[model samples]
Target: HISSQQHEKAIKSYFDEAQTQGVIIIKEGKNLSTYGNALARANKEYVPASTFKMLNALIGLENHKATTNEIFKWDGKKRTYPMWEKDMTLGEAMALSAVPVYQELARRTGLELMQKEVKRVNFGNTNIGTQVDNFWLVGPLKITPVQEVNFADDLAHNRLPFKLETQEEVKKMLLIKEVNGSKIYAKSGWGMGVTPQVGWLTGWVEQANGKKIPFSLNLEMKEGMSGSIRNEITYKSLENLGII
Candidate 1:
C-alpha cells in the first residue's frame, strides 16, 4: 500500500514471535495469509471505527463535498488529542485521522447520501442507520477484516467505481512514510467504544521490488500504549514478510 513460501514462513514468524493477543489477517494479491489465527474475529463484523476515514476521504472527494486541500476550520474547542486543533487541510486531517474533520465531512455528506456511497463500494455492512457521526464510530456501520483488504485491494489498482483520478489522488494522501525506497500507505484506527477496545492498522506496503502487499490487522487493545502496540505488531509482521 506495499510474496510466497519463505515469504509465508517469515510472515508467520513475525506474528508468532510477537504473539500479541491481537490478530492479523492479510491478503496479498493472489494469496490469503493465515498466520496469527486471525480469521475468526476477522470475519465477525466490528465497528470500523476510524478505518472508515479511508472511505470518508474518498466520498468527500468524489462528491465534490470537499477538495484534497479543503480547509477544515477549527471549532475553537480544545481537544484531548493534541494534533486536531487549528485549521487543517483535508490531507492533514486524514494524515492525523482527525475525527472532528471527518465528522464534519460525514455530517456534510449526511447519512442518507453516505449510505448510497458506501453500498456502491460494497463496503462493510453498508448499514449506517440514523447516525452519521456515530455509525462507523460506534453504531451499526460495521466491517470485517476481509472487507478491509478488499477495499484496500481495489484502491491499489484504482479499480473502485469512483473516479480513478480521485482514487489516485487519495492514494497519495494515504502514505505513512517511505523506507528503503518503498512506500507504506496505511491508516490506524482506535475503537474505544467496543468491549475489549479494538485497534487497527490496515493498508498496503509497496515494496521496492514492485510488490504490493495488502494487509488488515485488528487487536484486542489495552488502555495504555494500544496504538503503539498496533503498529508494533503490524510493522513487525510486514518486515517479516520482507515487504518493509
Candidate 2:
C-alpha cells in the first residue's frame, strides 16, 4: 500500500530529470511508501545484477567458501573500474561491487551449493543456471524491487534461512554511511551487460527513531548514463519524505 502521496511530484522529478523510468519502494513496518509507478514498476522484475552480492556473501560465509576477513586477490587483469584492480576483503569488495571478486566467490561456492542456498533462502527466481558465476548478471535470475526490499528486510531482521553468524556478517558488510544518528547500509548495481540497462540500489536505513526502513530502487540506465544517479534519486526521494 502506497500511503504517502506527498512524495509524488518531487520523486518523479528525480527520475524525469535523469531521463529514466524506475520505481522506489520504502517500507516502514507494515506501511509501504512508493514513488513513480509504484504498483506496476515495483513488481516488474529485472536482473539482480551486482545486488546478488548480498546473497553471495551469505552463501559464501555459510559454506566456508571464504571467511569474513579473507582477502580476494586481484587476478591482475585489466578491470573496467580502477578501484576493482586491487586485492580486497569481503567487505571492501561488497562496497565496491567488484565483479571479479564476487565471480571468484561464485566459482568457489560452485553451482550445486549456489542453487541449493539460493532456493533455501528463496531469493529471486532461484535459478542460478549452469554457469554459477554469470547467472545473476546475465539471465535466469531476476528480482523485482519489491522482492529486493523483502530480502533486505529479512537480512536486516535476521529472518532469512541462514546461520545467524552468516546473516550478521553480511549485514555488517552492507553498512555504507551514517547521518544524524541514522545509518544507511546499501549496495548498488548496474546491469550494463543488458540492452536498455537497469540500475539498482537496495538496502535499509536504520533511522534515528530506531526503525529500520528497507528500500529498493531500480531504473532504466541507458548507455553513457552515470550510475551515480541511482543513489542521487534514492537519497533525494527519501529526503523528500523526511525519511533520512
Candidate 3:
C-alpha cells in the first residue's frame, strides 16, 4: 500500500514540474489526493466524452434498454447534430467510439433514464440534463482524474451500483490487452476548444499470478496532440510510478 505521505510527495513532485491542471493516482482502491490551480481552471464538470459510454452501456443492459447481441442495421449514413457519419453495431459502436449509434441509443433511452443510470454510478458533478445529442459521442463530457480513479476502483471491486451481469459485460468490453504483457482497459476523449482535448485511460492490470490491480489515468492537453505523444507520456508516467 502507498502511504498517504508518499502519495503526497509523489504528487507534489509531478505537479511541481509539469504544467498540469490536475493529477490524481489510485493504487489498488485508495486515492492519493492532490490538486492545483490548473485543476480548478479546467472545469471539472465538462462533458465526460466516451468514458460515459461505459456507464451508458451498463445502464442500457441493466434496464433491458439494449442488448449486445441485438443487431441493428448499419444504414451507412452519418448523423447531423455533432456531425458524425458511420454505420456500426452496439459492440462496434463502443469499440470504435461511434457517436451516431450512442446518440441514437441515448435518444431512445431518453434523458431521464440516462440521468438515472449516470446518477447510479455516482460520477463527478455531471449535468445529465444537457441533451444527449449536445454531448459528443466520444467527446465533451465532464470528468476529472480524481473521479476517474474512483470509478475505476469501483469497477475493480465490482462495487458499482449496477446489475452484476451488466457490470461483467462492461468489464469485458472495456478491458483490452496492451502490446506488452499488461492488460489495460481504457477509453480516450477528444473535443475542440482551446484545450480542445480530453483523454481517459482507466482500467486494471492483471498480474502474472492472476491478481488484478486497478488504475485510472487521464491526460487533458491542447487539441491536435498526436496519439504518439499521448502514448509516450502514458508509458513514461507509468514507468516512473512503477505501475507498468
Candidate 4:
C-alpha cells in the first residue's frame, strides 16, 4: 500500500515449506511485501500472545513494577517449558519468553495501570479483556502485522509514550543477537489456544548500513510449529532483503 515492491514467490516458498498461511511486511519507511494478501492479512487482528510482553515490559519498567535486578521465582507448579522451571531475571525471562514471570509482573502492575498504558500507546484492540494477568494471551487484545511495524517503528525511535529509559531497557532486553555493527532485535509469539494457532516474530532490524527496517511476520499453524518458526522465517527474509 505504501508503494513498496515484493519479490515474486519469495515469501510463499517459505510459507509452503512450513505448511502455513502467513504474511511478512518489512519497512524502512517504505512498507514492502511479497504476498498479494499482505495488506489484508497484516490488517486482520489476532490474539497478541507474548508479543504483548514488550508493551508490558515498557509499562512495568516505567511504573517500577518490574526490575531487572530482582529475580522472578518459579512456583512449585511446573509447566512443559524446561527453561521456565528456574528463577529468572527480567532479561533471562525475556530471552526465554517465560510466561509466568511476566504474568507476575502483570498482576503486580494491575489492570488499571496496564489499561491506561496500553491505551496511551494505542496498542492493538486496546481491550485487555477481563483477566488482568491473562488478557494478552487470550482474546480482545489483538494486533496485525501491518500495525505492529508502526509500533516497532515508534519503539525504534524511542517515541513511545513511556519513559525513554523504559523504552531503551525493554529494547535491550529484546535483542536476540548483535555483532559487527548489525543488530537483530525480535520477539516470537505463539498462541495455541485456538484450533489453528497463531505465531509471530515482530521487531526491527538495524542493519550495518544504518537502515532500521521494521518488520512483522505472522503465520497460521496447526501443530509441529514452535515459536522458533517466527525467527526462522524472519531471519531468512532479512537475509533476502540484504538487511542483515
Candidate 5:
C-alpha cells in the first residue's frame, strides 16, 4: 500500500500533467480516501462506452438469463440485434468486448430488465433506454470516479443485493492475470466523439493474501486519440510510481 504522503504527491503530479477534471483513489483499509476536482464538474456526464457492459453482465446473471460458460454462435452475419461477427463464450465476449454478444444479452434480458438492474446496481444516474447504435451501447447511464469506487467496494464486500454466484461471474469477467502472486482484474472503456472524449478503466487488484483493492480510473483526452498514447501514458505512470 502507498503511504498517504506518497499518494498525495502522485495525485498532484497526475493532475499537474493530465489536467484531469476529476480523480478518486481509495486504498484498502484506508478510512479516508483522496480526490481532485471531484466536485468541479459534478454535473457533467459522458458516454460510458463498454463500461456499461459490467452492469449488463450483472443484470443478465442476476435474472438467470445468461451464464459465463454460455456459448454464443457467430455466423459472421452482421445485424443490429445481435451485433458481432463471430461465435464467442461469455468470458471471451468480455475479453474481446464483442458488442453483438452484449446486444444479445441485452435483448434477452430486455430493456426493462436492464433498466431495473442498472438502478439496482446503483450506477449513479445512468439511463439505459436509448437504443444501441454503431456498435455502441448508448443508454441513460453516467458515473463518476467516486460512484465507481462505491460500486467496486460494494462488489468486493458482497454488499450488493444479488446472488453470490452472479457477482462471482461478474468478477470473473474483470479478472486479468496473476503477477508475482497478486491477482489483477480490469475493464476499460473508450469513446471518440467531437463533444466528449472519455475513457475508463475500473476494477480490482487482489493480493496473494486475499486482500482486495478496488480502483476506478477515468481518462479524457482530445478527440481522435489513439490507444497507443493511452497505453504509453498508463505504462509510464505505473512504472514511475513503482506500481507495475
Candidate 6:
C-alpha cells in the first residue's frame, strides 16, 4: 500500500541521524515493501544475536527443555546488565535481552536438538555450528533480514512446524507492546561479534484492520552507536508507514 520512495523517505532520517545505514523489509502477505538498501541487505546474512531468542523459546517449549511457567534461576554471577541479575522466566529473559538465561536454556537444549529444530524450520542458513550456547551470538549461525521476516511471519500466523500451542506460547513471549489498536511483537538484537556490528529489531504488527505486517530491519551499527536505536528506528518506521 506504500511506494518505494515513500517507504525509503519515511525511514531514511532515522538511519541518517544514527550515522549508519540499514534496511527494512516489510511483508504484507505476498508483497514486500522495502526501504534503504533492502535489495542487497535483505538477503545478506549476519549473526542473529538475541533475536534468536524467539526461536530459542520455541525450541525450548517444543522439546520440553523449558516451560512457560518455569523460572530460570540466575547463577548469582553478576552481569553487566542489571535486569539480567535476577531469576526470571523465558519471556522475562527475552524482554530484558538477558543473554545468560537463554544461554542456559541453549545449554539445556544441547547442540543436537538445536541443530535439528533449526533445520526443521529451515531457518536462515540452517547452520548452528558445534557450540550450543554461543553459536547464534557469535558465529556459525546467521540469518538475513528477509529470513527474519519469514520466521516472524510463520510464528505470527501459528504456521511454524511446531505444535500450535508451542508456537502460541513463544508468540506470547514476543509481545513488545500494544497501542492504537495495533499490537507489535518484536525482538531487538545486537550482533557484537561482527565487525561494525549489526543491529536488528524484527517482528510483525497486527493492524486494527486485521492485517499482519511482518517486518525485519537491520542497521549497520557504526562504532559508538547505541543498541537502543534499533527499536527507536523501527518504531518510527512503523509510525511513518502509518501502521501504529
List candidate 3 segments past 4 Å from native: 1-24, 33-43, 79-87, 136-141, 193-196
| lDDT, residue 17, model 5 | 64
Preferred candidate (TM-score higher): 4 or 5: 4
Lowest lDDT 10-residue stretch of candidate 6: 33-42
Q: How accurate is candidate 1 locally (lDDT)?
A: 0.79
Query: Candidates sorted by lDDT, descending order?
Result: 2, 6, 4, 1, 5, 3
- Across 1-244, the per-residue lDDT of candidate 2 in tens digits comes to 4445656977887888887888899898866767864347888879999999999999998899999889999888899989999999999999999999999999999999899999998888888889988999887898988899999898888899888889989999998878778888899999887776889999999988778899999898876788888888888888887878
Candidate 3 per-residue C-alpha lDDT over 1-244 given as tens digits, one digit per residue, 9 for 90 to 100:
6665664555445544444334444465364533322445233544566667777777777878778877655566544432234445566677666666767678878878777767767776655666766454333346666677677777766789987777888777776556356666655554433254655555666655555665544555544455443344444455455566
Residue 110 miss distance in model 1 (angstroms): 1.1
Pairing residues by index, what is the TM-score of model 4? 0.92
Best first by TM-score, ranked = 2, 6, 4, 1, 5, 3
Model 2: ten consecutive residues of lowest lDDT: 30-39
Per-candidate Cα lDDT values, in order, are 0.79, 0.88, 0.59, 0.80, 0.63, 0.87
Please provide, for model 4 over 39-109, each residue's C-alpha lDDT reduced to its tens digit, 9 standing for 90 to 100.
36878888888888889888888999978778988886876688789998888888888999999999999
TM-score of each model, paired residue for residue: 0.90, 0.95, 0.75, 0.92, 0.78, 0.95
- lDDT tens string, model 6, 101-145? 899899999989999999999988889999999998888889988
lDDT of 3 at 127: 57
Could you tell me the lDDT of residue 103 within candidate 6?
90
Predicted structure 2: clash tally: 0
Worst 10 residues of 3 by lDDT: 34-43
Backbone collisions counted per model? 6, 0, 11, 0, 9, 0
Query: Against the true structure, what is every candidate's RMSD?
Result: 3.2, 2.1, 4.7, 2.9, 4.1, 1.6
Name the runs in model 2 displaced over 4 angstroms: 1-3, 37-39
